[PDB]
Amino acid sequence: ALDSQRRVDVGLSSISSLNSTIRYSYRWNKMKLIQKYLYRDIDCIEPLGKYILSSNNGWSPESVVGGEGIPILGQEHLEFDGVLNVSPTKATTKTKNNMENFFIQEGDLFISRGNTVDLVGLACVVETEVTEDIIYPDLYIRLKIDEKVIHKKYLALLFNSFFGRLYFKYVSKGKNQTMVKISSNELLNYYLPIPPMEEQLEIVGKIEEQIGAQNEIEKQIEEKRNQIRVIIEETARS
Amino acid sequence: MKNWQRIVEAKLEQQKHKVAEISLENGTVNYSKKIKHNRNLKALTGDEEIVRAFLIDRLVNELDYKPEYLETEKEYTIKGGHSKINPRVDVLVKDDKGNPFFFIEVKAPNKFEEDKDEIEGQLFALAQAEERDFKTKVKYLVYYTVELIDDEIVDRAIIIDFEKYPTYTDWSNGGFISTGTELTAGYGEPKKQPLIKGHEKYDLRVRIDREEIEGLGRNLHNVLWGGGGTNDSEIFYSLVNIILAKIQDEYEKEDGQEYDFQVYQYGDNVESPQKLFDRINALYKRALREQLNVTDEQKIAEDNVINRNKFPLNKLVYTVQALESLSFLEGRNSLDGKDILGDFFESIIRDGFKQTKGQFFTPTPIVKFILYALQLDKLAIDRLNNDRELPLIIDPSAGSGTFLIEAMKLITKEVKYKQNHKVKSSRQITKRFEELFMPDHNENKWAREYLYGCEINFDLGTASKVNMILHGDGSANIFVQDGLLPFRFYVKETSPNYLETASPDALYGDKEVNGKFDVVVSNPPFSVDLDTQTQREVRNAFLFGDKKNSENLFIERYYQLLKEGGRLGVVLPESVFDTTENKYIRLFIFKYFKVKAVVSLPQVTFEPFTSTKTSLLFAQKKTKEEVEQWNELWDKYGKEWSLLKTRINDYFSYFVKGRPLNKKWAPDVVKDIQEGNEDNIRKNIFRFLKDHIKEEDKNLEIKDLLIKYAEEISSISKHEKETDVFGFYNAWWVFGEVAKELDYPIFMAEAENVGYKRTKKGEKPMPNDLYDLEYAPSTLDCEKVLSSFDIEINALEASKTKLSVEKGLLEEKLKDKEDKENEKIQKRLNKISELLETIENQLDSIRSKKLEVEGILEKYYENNKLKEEYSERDDEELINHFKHGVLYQYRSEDILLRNKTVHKILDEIRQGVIWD
Numbered sequence A: 001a002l003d004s005q006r007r008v009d010v011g012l013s014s015i016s017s018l019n020s021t022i023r024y025s026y027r028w029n030k031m032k033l034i035q036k037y038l039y040r041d042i043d044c045i046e047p048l049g050k051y052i053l054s055s056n057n058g059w060s061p062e063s064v065v066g067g068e069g070i071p072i073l074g075q076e077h078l079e080f081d082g083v084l085n086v087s088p089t090k091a092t093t094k095t096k097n098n099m100e101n102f103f104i105q106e107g108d109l110f111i112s113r114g115n116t117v118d119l120v121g122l123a124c125v126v127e128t129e130v131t132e133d134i135i136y137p138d139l140y141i142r143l144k145i146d147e148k149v150i151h152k153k154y155l156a157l158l159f160n161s162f163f164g165r166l167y168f169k170y171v172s173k174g175k176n177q178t179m180v181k182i183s184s185n186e187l188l189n190y191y192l193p194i195p196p197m198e199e200q201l202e203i204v205g206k207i208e209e210q211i212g213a214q215n216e217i218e219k220q221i222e223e224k225r226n227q228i229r230v231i232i233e234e235t236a237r238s
Numbered sequence B: 001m002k003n004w005q006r007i008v009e010a011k012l013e014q015q016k017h018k019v020a021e022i023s024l025e026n027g028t029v030n031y032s033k034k035i036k037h038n039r040n041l042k043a044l045t046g047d048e049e050i051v052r053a054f055l056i057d058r059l060v061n062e063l064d065y066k067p068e069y070l071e072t073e074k075e076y077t078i079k080g081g082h083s084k085i086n087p088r089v090d091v092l093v094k095d096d097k098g099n100p101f102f103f104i105e106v107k108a109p110n111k112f113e114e115d116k117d118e119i120e121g122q123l124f125a126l127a128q129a130e131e132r133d134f135k136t137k138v139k140y141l142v143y144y145t146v147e148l149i150d151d152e153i154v155d156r157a158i159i160i161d162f163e164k165y166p167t168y169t170d171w172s173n174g175g176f177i178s179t180g181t182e183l184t185a186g187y188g189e190p191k192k193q194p195l196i197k198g199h200e201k202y203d204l205r206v207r208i209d210r211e212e213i214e215g216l217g218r219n220l221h222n223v224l225w226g227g228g229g230t231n232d233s234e235i236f237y238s239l240v241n242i243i244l245a246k247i248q249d250e251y252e253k254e255d256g257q258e259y260d261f262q263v264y265q266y267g268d269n270v271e272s273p274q275k276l277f278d279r280i281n282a283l284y285k286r287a288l289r290e291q292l293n294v295t296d297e298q299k300i301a302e303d304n305v306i307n308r309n310k311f312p313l314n315k316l317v318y319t320v321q322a323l324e325s326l327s328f329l330e331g332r333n334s335l336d337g338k339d340i341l342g343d344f345f346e347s348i349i350r351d352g353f354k355q356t357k358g359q360f361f362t363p364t365p366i367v368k369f370i371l372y373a374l375q376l377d378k379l380a381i382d383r384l385n386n387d388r389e390l391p392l393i394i395d396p397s398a399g400s401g402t403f404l405i406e407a408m409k410l411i412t413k414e415v416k417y418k419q420n421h422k423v424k425s426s427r428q429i430t431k432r433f434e435e436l437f438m439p440d441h442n443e444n445k446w447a448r449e450y451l452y453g454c455e456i457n458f459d460l461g462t463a464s465k466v467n468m469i470l471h472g473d474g475s476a477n478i479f480v481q482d483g484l485l486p487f488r489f490y491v492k493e494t495s496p497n498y499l500e501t502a503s504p505d506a507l508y509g510d511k512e513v514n515g516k517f518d519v520v521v522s523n524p525p526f527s528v529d530l531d532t533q534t535q536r537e538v539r540n541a542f543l544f545g546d547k548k549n550s551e552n553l554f555i556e557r558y559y560q561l562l563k564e565g566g567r568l569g570v571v572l573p574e575s576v577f578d579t580t581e582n583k584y585i586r587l588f589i590f591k592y593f594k595v596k597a598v599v600s601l602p603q604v605t606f607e608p609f610t611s612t613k614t615s616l617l618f619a620q621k622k623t624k625e626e627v628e629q630w631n632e633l634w635d636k637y638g639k640e641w642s643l644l645k646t647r648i649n650d651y652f653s654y655f656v657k658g659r660p661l662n663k664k665w666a667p668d669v670v671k672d673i674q675e676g677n678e679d680n681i682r683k684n685i686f687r688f689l690k691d692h693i694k695e696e697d698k699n700l701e702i703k704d705l706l707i708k709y710a711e712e713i714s715s716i717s718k719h720e721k722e723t724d725v726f727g728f729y730n731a732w733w734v735f736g737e738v739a740k741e742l743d744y745p746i747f748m749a750e751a752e753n754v755g756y757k758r759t760k761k762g763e764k765p766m767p768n769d770l771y772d773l774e775y776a777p778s779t780l781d782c783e784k785v786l787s788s789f790d791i792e793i794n795a796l797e798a799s800k801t802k803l804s805v806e807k808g809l810l811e812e813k814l815k816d817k818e819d820k821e822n823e824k825i826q827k828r829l830n831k832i833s834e835l836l837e838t839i840e841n842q843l844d845s846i847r848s849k850k851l852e853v854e855g856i857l858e859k860y861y862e863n864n865k866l867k868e869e870y871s872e873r874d875d876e877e878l879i880n881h882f883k884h885g886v887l888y889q890y891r892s893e894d895i896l897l898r899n900k901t902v903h904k905i906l907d908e909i910r911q912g913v914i915w916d
């Protein structure tokens, strides 16, 4: 109801509330109103700039599907569960001068810079073994955070939740609805509910169990697929 | 019924020799048996046959020519490709030597502007056949038509010498050669009647018909533009210069002498396209020595009414010939020609001008939303009622004058026609309205006093001036002297000048502010690129001229032009609203303006020329009392913050950093440190921080709080960068404190669509989301849709009754005849009967929709007035009635001001915000 309003009545006093730059605009004030509604009962709201250690933007050179070079990812590899589904399809055949930090490592936080207004700012965590070094494209940000206060996967789950979707649909600056590009400035200024680490682990556990249930559903699905295969084979053989 | 048809019928009937008969009541025409006809003409094919008969009568009776040399309805049979073609020639008159003296093609007067494409299909083939057969040359080709001026029939004709231009290339370079407007008797060379004031026949046209202007526009698009050449700036500029020259002609040539725009034609035959360049150039100097009063000798010396390299003179002579009788300054006098020329020129700008980065036009739907969202109509009505004046609108960046033109057409329409009931009927108000709007021939007469503008581009300045002359204004106030030049430089001959006046303002900083205008609407350029010749205005005249963003100077200009309480509606880029570098300007507006609406716009608004997000800002200038209150509150809270900063930084050094206490500190500081009044310690932290602290912070120890904050407390401690204007205090802290006291509500909204989508190819309609058209007029006349509509149907009923009587007489006269030979014409009479029954069938069918629309009129209208429940067009049913079927006419495309129902952003603008 609040998000689909298209009209905001803003008071003058409301402008200078955690603003520090006196920004008045429809999008910024709509985002602030939605955040005020969200964080009403929730407490312990804190900025991400205090608990951020560093942010490094990746970069990707010219490449073709295949090419027998070092592999690169795609925009479809990002997932809502917060796990980077590593399955590169394209690679770069020519070499660069420096590639030390352009590879993907385990336990990293990747942020989507440029994508559709819906799937922008999408975050993922690399949990599987990287083994071979793989290049992550320019539309990514490696985010190193303070591990003592905030857990790596909790931020990804928050960003993929509506908490981050609503913020990034108004903060994103793009020339079209197909691609909108976020930057690091709003990552510095973003406000989060940061409960004790125990609560973050509890949330992660609930998400993991409710995703394992769905995993049981698709494993039943390939059980049905194998049944189809067996029926075809037994019909053909005799 | 039309008077001219009856006049023509009477003129043809008054002739002594009864050779042709017409009957409009019966809709029949009959001709003498002397000329053989291959078909039985029984129905009126159009005005073409009447014009041909009139020309035949004029030739036979008035010009005393022998009828034996006249040939009409000549049949040709040719085999073209796989088909057969039968072209026809209208009038052939040959002399004693056999050469065609008159080769006349007859066309309907209302079909001339659209039939030109068929001319090539009717004339060149016959000439080619004649060359193939006899290898002879035709001497003169004559194209004739009639025109109605003051109930008098005048003749406008084109005479082309075939031998003079034997080839198509020579004919194209000739530019529609017309030897003379009228013919001459006694084998004389053709002569054109002078176009001179004094004689009504010689005088120009003032009753401009609505349709031929569209034909002229499409002909210019198809001929001047080459068909394959679109969006060329230089051709448009040449056309603009030609129109300006024509305007100067009516301005200066005055009465008693012929105009110099027309071909002077000292000789009987029209001369070559040359020897007119000197004429038009001297005329183009007389213009800009009379209207613009320019003082550039190099610009006068370079001439350049046209450029010879890309504007050949054949198109020039075509344009000159096309615009001989279309008096622009006097065509607006007539009600029919009131808005014809303005629409013509706005179509010229719309189709022909190429616009891109830096130079592009604001779309009309945004302009009208800006003008109506300021309640400019209500402001003008209130100004007229209270102070007997109209608002003083200025647009300091008017490129094509779109904002000014829309403001003019809005004020005139609202005050004079739409909302005329709001204005009072007092004698003083009535006389002021008399000298403003009443004469009704030039209703845009007030503009000369109340409409200003500034443009930096000379070419677009001339374009704006000519556009706004053709729309009705004198266009004296539009300046081509840059938007940001000082108020002293803006000088022009006419005495009442509200832009010259200036005076320093103590609050502004001693800088000079005008303070004379009521409304300031503009579309500020993204980058001003201010000229290096006069850079003293950057520093001395403007507060923030030294900054990198030089476009933000425009906002400061808007403070100087507006009056205390004036209105400002502008399309600012979104970067002004959300960028730290622009913060200084955002603190500026809140200091002096009362922000009232920030309407965001989609990025499809300015496509395809630019793709950047822009927003609408509506603000009102603040009076001296409010800004001095702001200044005093700013000073108070800045001093309080100044004390808090020093105190809290002294607190940090001891209580966290550990530096021993010193007696050089403030007495309250030292005693609070000594006797440990930690409650005040916490209170000062809370007050200095304001936000950035939560409920957990109050219980937690102060030392850990300070360690945790550090960065935030340092950021708050740092003062501002602009200095002088703000006064060494923190803008965020003091701004929050002052805005708590002076709170007012701001309205914000976003539009997703703007009623159009301009791809590179063309426009495609979309939902508006900004405003809704009325779609239903507030004044509908029953007698306008009833009597004239029924005249045709009852005339046809009388005609078919007479036809039925004569058919019955023929039926009897064939009943007493023998059947075997009768059968063929009896079947023909049956065909006539079935034609009559089917025609009366569609008349009955259209009478049904007549009845249903009459029922709708009775249901929705009461004494030609929309009822209060139907006043606000929320009823989609009535709207769908008007925009369907035959109710396409009499529509109202005006913007609807509902004032009680909120559906689209403009309604929330006009209801939610208050301008006072």
Ligand SMILES: C[S@@+](CC[C@H](N)C(=O)[O-])C[C@H]1O[C@@H](n2cnc3c(N)ncnc32)[C@H](O)[C@@H]1O
Residues within 6 Å of the ligand: B358, B359, B360, B361, B362, B396, B397, B398, B399, B400, B401, B402, B403, B454, B455, B456, B457, B482, B483, B484, B522, B523, B524, B525, B526, B528, B529
């Ligand atoms: C915004 S466009 C169209 C303005 C108006 N909406 C119209 O339709 O005519 C006006 C153009 O004139 C130019 N212009 C106007 N005033 C100017 C000034 N004072 N200094 C520099 N350029 C100016 C801008 O570059 C802009 O491209």
